[PDB]
Structure formats: structure tokens, C-alpha cells
Amino acid sequence: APPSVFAEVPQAQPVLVFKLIADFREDPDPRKVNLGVGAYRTDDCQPWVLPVVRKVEQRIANNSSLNHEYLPILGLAEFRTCASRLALGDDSPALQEKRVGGVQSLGGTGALRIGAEFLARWYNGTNNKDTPVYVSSPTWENHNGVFTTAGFKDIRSYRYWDTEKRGLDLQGFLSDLENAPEFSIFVLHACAHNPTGTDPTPEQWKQIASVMKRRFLFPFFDSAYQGFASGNLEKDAWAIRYFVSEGFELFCAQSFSKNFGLYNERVGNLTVVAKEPDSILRVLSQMQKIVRVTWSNPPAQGARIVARTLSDPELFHEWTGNVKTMADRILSMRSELRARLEALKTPGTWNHITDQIGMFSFTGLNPKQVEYLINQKHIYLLPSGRINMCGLTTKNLDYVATSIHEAVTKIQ
Ligand SMILES: Cc1ncc(COP(=O)(O)O)c(CN[C@@](C)(CC(=O)O)C(=O)O)c1O
Numbered sequence: 198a199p200p201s202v203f204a205e206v207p208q209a210q211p212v213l214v215f216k217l218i219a220d221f222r223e224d225p226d227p228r229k230v231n232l233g234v235g236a237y238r239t240d241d242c243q244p245w246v247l248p249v250v251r252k253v254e255q256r257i258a259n260n261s262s263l264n265h266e267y268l269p270i271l272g273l274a275e276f277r278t279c280a281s282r283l284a285l286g287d288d289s290p291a292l293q294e295k296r297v298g299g300v301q302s303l304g305g306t307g308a309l310r311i312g313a314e315f316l317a318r319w320y321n322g323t324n325n326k327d328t329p330v331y332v333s334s335p336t337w338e339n340h341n342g343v344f345t346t347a348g349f350k351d352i353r354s355y356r357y358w359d360t361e362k363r364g365l366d367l368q369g370f371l372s373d374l375e376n377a378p379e380f381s382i383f384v385l386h387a388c389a390h391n392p393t394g395t396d397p398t399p400e401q402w403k404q405i406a407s408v409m410k411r412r413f414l415f416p417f418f419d420s421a422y423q424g425f426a427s428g429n430l431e432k433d434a435w436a437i438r439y440f441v442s443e444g445f446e447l448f449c450a451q452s453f454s455k456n457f458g459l460y461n462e463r464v465g466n467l468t469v470v471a472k473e474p475d476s477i478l479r480v481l482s483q484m485q486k487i488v489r490v491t492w493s494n495p496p497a498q499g500a501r502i503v504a505r506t507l508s509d510p511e512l513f514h515e516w517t518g519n520v521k522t523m524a525d526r527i528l529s530m531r532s533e534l535r536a537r538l539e540a541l542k543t544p545g546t547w548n549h550i551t552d553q554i555g556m557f558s559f560t561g562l563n564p565k566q567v568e569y570l571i572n573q574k575h576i577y578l579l580p581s582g583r584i585n586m587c588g589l590t591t592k593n594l595d596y597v598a599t600s601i602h603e604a605v606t607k608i609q
Contacts, residue, residue, distance in 0.1 A: 213338075217577050228596060229575040232588035235391070235556050236460060237523050240590045247458050247519045249512055253502045263501075267494050270485045272301020272466075276500040279507035280451055280466035284387075284420060284434050291441050291470050298477040300484050301495045302465035305421045305452025306339060311467050312417060312448045313347035314487050315480070320415070321380045326350055329381040331373070333357040335581065337391045340384050340419070355383070358393050363549045363561065365395050367404070374408040382415045387449070388426035388433040389555025392583040396426060396554060402436045406443055416440055421452035426554045428524030430517060446471050453503050455556070456520055462499030523587075527556060530589040534558075537598035544605050558584050566604045574600040 217233040230242075239245050257263065271277065277299030282292065291297045302308040321328045326348040332340045334354035344352055355377075356369025377383070390396050397405060409416060418437055426433040437449055449468040454460045467484075471477045488494070506512040535550040550558055562570070562582040570576045576597060578584050589597060 214579070217579075221577050224575060224577075226575045230577065230588060230593050230597060232576060232578040232584040232597070235455065235585050236587070237455065237458060237556070238585075238587045238590070240526065240592075242588075242590050242592070245458060245523070247516070249506055249516045249519055250457060250459065250502055252515075253505050253512065256505070257498075257501055265497075268301075268497055268500075270488050270494050271299075271481060272495045273497065273500040273504060275508060276504040277301055277466060279504055280453070281468045283430065283507060284423065284437055284449055284451060284468055285441060285470075286431065286434065286438055289438070289441060295474045296471045296477055298469040298471070298481050298484075300467040300469070300481065300488065301500055302450075302467050303492060303495065304454055304463040304465040305419060305450050306343065306465070307463065307492070308450035308452070308465040308467035309340070309343045309419065310347065310491070311484060311487055312450060312469075313344050313349070314491075315484055316382060316415075316417075316448075317347045317349060319480075319483060320382075329353050329378055331355050331377060331381055331383045333384070333386065333390070335392060336384070336386075337419070344384075349382075353377075353381075357390075358395065358559065363546075363559075364552070365397060365401070367397070367401055371404060371408060374405065374412065374414060377412060377414055379413045380415065381412075382417055383409065385416055385418050385436075387418045387420035387423065387437050389422035389557075391421070391555070392557050392579070392581060393559045394553030394555045394557045395559070397436075399435060399439070402439060406440055406445070409440075410443060410445065416445055416447045418447060418449040420449055422455055422555050423451070424456045424517075424520040425524055425527070425556060428521040428528075430520065441470055444472075453499070457499075457503055457506070457516075459499050459502065462502070463496065464499030464503055527586050530586045530594075531558070533591075533594055534586070534589055534598060537594060538601060541598060541602045543598075543602045544609065556585055556587055558586055560584055560601070562601070562604065563608075566608045569604050569608050570600055574604075576600050 214234050221231040237245055281297055281299040285291055302311055317326055318324055329351045330344045330349045331353050334357050341352055355373035356366045359366035388396050423433045424430045440447055447470050451466040453464040469480055506516050531551045535547055538547045560582045564580045567578060567580050
């Protein structure tokens, strides 16, 4: 009897956020509510394909001049240019000086992967897998997984969330920067921090930038929610743009999954800013090799939609309107969920619910409370106490606020 070559493969733990989408879908209880994955939902609790996207899909579908031939390894040129322009702004001195590069990627995740793979080979030496990599405490789980997979052995965290203050621990963060070895890589959330929903103010960003510049720390921005932090694309990109004006060289992993609602078309872009043009050229050539052995070349549908919307003043205007619409609904739900919790006179303060920005809220519930909420009330969320505000609708608001109350009460 010959045994199987897969006999010893262990059962892996499940990617939780996707594990719950499954549990939710198949859960038969009617009063179930998915406050899990960070995807927008209308007030009717439905996915929303943006009107502008619908528009363009139709145009693309009626364009017979378009073929399916392979795209360049680095991706659709028009897309890479518009994506980078969106984050840096058209008046960017970096764009003017041609020291900006863009690599089309598979969502923000793919962009993060490509940048980590490049750094692990050409940054701070050759194949230097030892440069420390810093992620916020807490942060999006996949930050660790992505950098670990790229080979970095030393992943550290910088203090960010202050539990006994329910906000940003600036001194902690600043202290961690001061103490970070020179050349260390810092993974920064450009805006709408995940999972806290707490971002530094421009004044704090200035302090953060000041230490980074002094200690030659590398800013690797994750920008997955441009436009959600406030509803304004220009505003949500200010930090990245400030670093650029300060002369930093940096990476910016861009995702169009949430702001274009193109979740399943995997549209991402890795923007690179260098001190001089010649370097962008050499960098992209190394990036081509990395891409070639990962996905060979990127898919066209998503990039085509984003490219057409961003290069047509009319589609662009319209898109900015749809974005603001989503952001506005998140602001509306924050005020409501807070009201109800106060009316129910729920133990403790809950101002933070309206203080945090973006799609998420770091509620503050112990895990035992989350288990109660998921098992008893069928209100799916993460163990950490993070909730997707978009999951709230004028309907289920009371059920949730009730459940959160009962929890806090007969659970604490
Ligand atoms: C901070 C951050 N960066 C990158 C990504 C990846 O975006 P992509 O889909 O373009 O690769 C996410 C997505 N976070 C989600 C919305 C989903 C997930 O975990 O993948 C979340 O629920 O946190 C994110 O929250």
C-alpha cells in the first residue's frame, strides 16, 4: 500500500474574515447580520455596484474594438498613470519631475506583495531579509502575512491604539519611531485606519514624518480607502502628498476595491516615488521580473473601468459623487448607532463611535461579548470588536444596538 503525498498535510486555520462571510450566508436565522467583511452595503442591506461603474461596464461591453490580448507585464498604462495621479494629485512635483512609477496589481493585497518582494531583494542591501518591518498595533491581519511570506524575519509593531483613552497613542507611536533602527520599513495606513478607524491629524502626521525623515525610515503606505475617511479624495490623500513634498522616497499600495466597489475585479496599483527618474526605470524593471513569476500579467476589466472613469471629467465627477454618497451614509450610521446606545443607556461612554472615520469602528467589546453576539444574536463581526458600519441599516439598527446592550450588560 503506497501512502498519499498529502498524508501529512495539516488542516490550516481559516482566513477568518472570509470564514464568516460563509457562516453568514449559510446561517438560516433571519435576524442574522453581517457586520464582518469591510464591504459597502446600501440601507436595504444590499451590495452597491456604483452607478458610474454600471455606466462604463455598458460602454466597454459595446466596444468591439477592444480585444483580449495580454496587457503589458506592468499593466494598462492609462490605468497606472491615472491611479498614481489620483493619490499624488496632478500638481505633484514628483509627477512633474517624472520620478514616479506605477505597477498595476491584484488589488491592494497584490500591490503590497510586489512591494514587499522587491524590498526583500533590493532594499537596504541585497536579499536583506533582516530589515525590521513595522506594522501598527493593531492592524489588518494580512499585513503580517504578506511581509512574512516575502521573507522578512523581523516584524515588529508600533503602538497606535490607546485602549485606556480610546484613540491614538501618539507618544507611544513617536517613541517606537525614535527607537526603530535606521532604514526600518513602516507600513502606514494612509487614512481610515483598519481596524481602529483612527487616523493622526495633519499636525501629528507632521511629527511622525519628522522622525521618519531623521531616522531614514521607509514609508510603505497602504491606501485602500481613499475617499472614505472623509468623503473627499483630495483630503484623504493629504498625508501621502505631504511625505512627497518633504522629499521622501516611498511606496503606496493602492486599492480600488472599496472606492470603486470593484472588490472581485482585483484592481490595485503600486505607486513608487523616487528621488530621481533614472531609479524609477531600474525599479520597474526589477518589478517586471517579480510580476512575471507571480501572475505573469494583470487582468484588464477592472483597470479598464477605473481608467475610463478617471480620465473622463464627467465620469470622474460622477464617481466623486458616488463616493461621497457612501461616506455620507457611514457618517449617518455612526450618529445613529451612538444615539441608540445612549438611549438604551448602555454602560460606559460611546462617543468613539462617531469619532472614528472610514468603514470601521473599534467598539471595545471583549471577545466573550463577540461570541455572544455571533452565537446568540447572529450578529457576525470580528473577535477584536470591529464592526462594519455599512452593515447597519435604518432597519437592523435597533436589533444591533439592543444586542450590543444586552451583551455589555449580562456579559460584563
Ligand atoms: C488596510 C487594508 N489594506 C488592504 C486591503 C486589501 O484590499 P484588496 O481587496 O484590494 O486586496 C484591505 C482590505 N480589507 C477588508 C475589506 C477585506 C480583507 O480583509 O481582505 C477587511 O475586511 O478588512 C485593508 O483593509
